[PDB]
Every structure is written in structure tokens, then in C-alpha cells.
Structure 1
């Protein structure tokens, strides 16, 4: 007999179907609670949390570690790339020299004194010393564990 779909309760007569969260699904019936994406096509897994079944992007958005920019004070979503210095995170466009206002980018030399960033050519001698190298941007949310991840298997009926 046909398997029943956990999404709609109907028999699955489709040639291709999904298995996830130890249920069978018509692919169209396995959708992100937030954005309605068809999980079996967009990616390889779903995330279960707080009664929802989510795509990776909405799992990150709703449950990932957001932060805040040390320069402007405003929130930074878990999905956003940030610059780092001295244990702080920054919007890319907030990561600027305090003297000349140039945006600092990976590989640039810079100084940091009490929260103020300075480019290589604006060494604040009067205030002063250590030269730092700007790292590549990284995701605000960083790495996260797979405890809520549930792989999707694409099957032929």
C-alpha cells in the first residue's frame, strides 16, 4: 500500500517523494513553516524547533546567535558577515578609521585604542602601538551544532 504524507494525510502515489523526521512526504508538502520553501528541493535538510519545521536560513534567522555592532550599537542578524577586532563585532561599513573614515578591509594594517580603530596611515602617535591585520569577514552567528537538523532523503516510489 502507499505511504501516507505527514503534511497532508493523503496517500503518496508520486514517483518521487521524501523521507524526513521519520515520515514520508509529497515533496510539495514538506515546507518551511516561515518562508514556505520546498525543503526537499532547496537543500538537504530541515530543522525542527519550537513546533516548526524550518529551512536552514530561517533556523539561523530565528534561533542563531545575533549580535550587535560595537561602533553603531545596532543589532546584527546571525546571517550577516561581520568584521572583528578585540572581541567586538562590526558591520562591514562601520569598520572604519576614526581619523580618515576609510573602511578597513581584510589584509589592512590597523590600530585599536579603547574602541577607536585607526588605519595604518593614521597611527595615533599622540594617543600612544601594536599593528593588527584585518581578518576576513565571518558570519555573525558563527558555527552552530546540528542538534535540530533532520536530513531529508529523496526517494523513488
Structure 2
């Protein structure tokens, strides 16, 4: 079937169709709102627009999953799946212990963190091992830009 472009909402007739999550794009519509460069690599989406990494970061900050405060661009962060935290907010909600690199924990669906010991006692969460602190740059990844073609049978 012929998808409509998430950008311009027209049917995409190009042989190569771009896919960002489960939305389809014209390659000529998947351009940074700011600098107009084609997004070959990663797409950074916010509200009604899409950006390159540089122009996304120049413009937007990241909220901590836990405290909902801004994380300064000049500070490292912790990550569990897609969630981003201040180091001091990367802590068990039950015992309040700050998790260190390598610590075993469980991530609840909404981003709440539970140390292994407290989770298993209380017991669902996803089991994880705490990653090293990451630079604010490499924290938000954006979405991969995938490629598909029209192929028979149609």
C-alpha cells in the first residue's frame, strides 16, 4: 500500500520510502526544520517538527524522568532504556540509595527505579544493569531513519 508522508501528508510515489518509527516520509520532506539538511542518519522529533542532532540540542533541553527538572547540557546523565536521569535521581524509589555503575535494578514501565533487593522482596519491572554516566550529547539518540522500497506484487 502507498503510505502518506508524515511531513506533507501526500502519497509517497518515490521508489525509496523512509520510515521513522512507524511513520513514512518522502526523503525530500525529512529535513531539519532549522538548517534544511536531509536527515539521512537520525531524526530528532519534537512537537510538529523534525531536526538534526545539533539543531535539536541548540534548542531543547532534556527533563529528568524522576524530578522533571532540566538537566544542564554541561552535565553527564544516567539512562535506563529511553529514560534519562540526573545521577542523583538515578536512585531506588524504596530505599533512596543512588545506583552506581554496575548495580542491578528493575525499571518500571513509567521510569520508576527499584534496586534488585527491594524489588525481589516486594515481589512488573524490567531487569537492568546500571550503565556508566553518559555525556548529554550521546544521551538522546533520536530515531533511526529506515529505508524501504516498493516491490511487487502490488
- TM bin, normalised by shorter chain, reads 0.3 to 0.5
TM-score normalised by the chain length of structure 2:
0.47
Alignment TM-score, normalising by the size of structure 1: 0.46
Q: Which entry has the higher C-alpha Rg, 1 or 2?
A: 1
